[PDB]
Amino acid sequence: MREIVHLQAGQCGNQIGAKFWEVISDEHGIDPTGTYHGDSDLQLERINVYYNEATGGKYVPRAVLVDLEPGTMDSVRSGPFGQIFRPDNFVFGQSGAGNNWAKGHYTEGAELVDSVLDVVRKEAESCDCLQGFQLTHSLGGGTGSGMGTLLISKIREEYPDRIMNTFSVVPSPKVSDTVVEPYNATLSVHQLVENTDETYCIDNEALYDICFRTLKLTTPTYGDLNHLVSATMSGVTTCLRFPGQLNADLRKLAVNMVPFPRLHFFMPGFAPLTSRGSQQYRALTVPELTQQMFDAKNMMAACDPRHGRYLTVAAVFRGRMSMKEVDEQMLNVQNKNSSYFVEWIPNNVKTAVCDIPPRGLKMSATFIGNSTAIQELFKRISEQFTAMFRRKAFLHWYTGEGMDEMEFTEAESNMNDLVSEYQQYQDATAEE
């Protein structure tokens, strides 16, 4: 029946996908061996969305790991749950990307792409009917950013009637990992705005700040960030994984959340981010959740939503509370904070409550919104790209691959068009 095919790209993408798989297996009651060890009710009926029915009830994961370096498969396989996946899906090459989008797309994206197309088409035909494809990757490298966009384009071309959601990682001038990162970001944004349904923004610096100032962790590492993003996606996908009273799905939000195809980015966020000594002193209620989903402090963005106006808001809840409190809260928020949302569109907040609470936590609620706060990231990326492209630094590497420089020109032209559009829609006046 209705299933979702999951895709993997990039070492960071691989690790976050593995963390998500471990989280969902633990929540749904799956032993590391491969059998079932759950004790719930809804964990058997719709469990096939991410798994596959097999003999002996041994459900198998549904995710294809795409990488250019063999060193990631061994790392992700040696873990407590790396022996449950499909080794056939671990399609790795012999040469690394070298943090090059052009070289990876050209050289390591021709002779290796056929195998992943074959395996994904086999998986697609293995099921009856599908909805969309989930790909988790990062733009920091030639593996995730160089390959995911290509696989995204191919799957759109073959099956246009599918949902295209991703959780790519946005860069940050403060926290960098690649010298040519602005070039890769500029190249990837073109494909993201041309050949992708929807995209979610992921930043590591904001998560680091959030954990440091709220979670108050001793030695925060990438494991904590992977846990956070896995919980984020779990709260995102519980609308279909665990039906409640008011259920939703990915295309319904994708239609109701996106006013125009060119602006498909979002701003995810989870509500209960507390310290270890604060877990036993907290008041589980609605207004607290509303305040933590509305404030910019809890938000995982490396920017400020208060600089613009809110466009669309979706509040997805997961618990057993009520319905009246949500509508009254959003009503009084829109009445009070009138200068923070678009006045031309009333009722920009969407209600969604999942009657099934998560495993390990009783109340949970995520925030999916598209606020006017990415414009600063866009403009700073455009500025740094223009500065890099003025004297044409770090360009001979891409030139030697074969592709020309006009691609950067058209990419920055589209960049300027997109940002102009964004800022002339930020001030969405009522009339003249």
Binding site: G402, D404, E405, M406
Partner: protein
Amino acid sequence: MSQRQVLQVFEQYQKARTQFVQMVAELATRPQNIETLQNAGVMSLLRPLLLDVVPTIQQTAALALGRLANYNDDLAEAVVKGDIL
């Protein structure tokens, strides 16, 4: 792959000149390096620049030859003496 590389190398020299040309869309504005390269009768080396395969190259190779010809009387007469007219 050998036949694909046949097509590929042909198109690769094709697009190499294409890119030289889409650059000389703005390179031709600069005469000092044009003369620096040109001194050794390199108008003969610009003779095969009309032997330039597809529209994607010729299209701005003409824009090159233009600003090449603006620099003096002699470069405009070079299309005559180089038998490029």
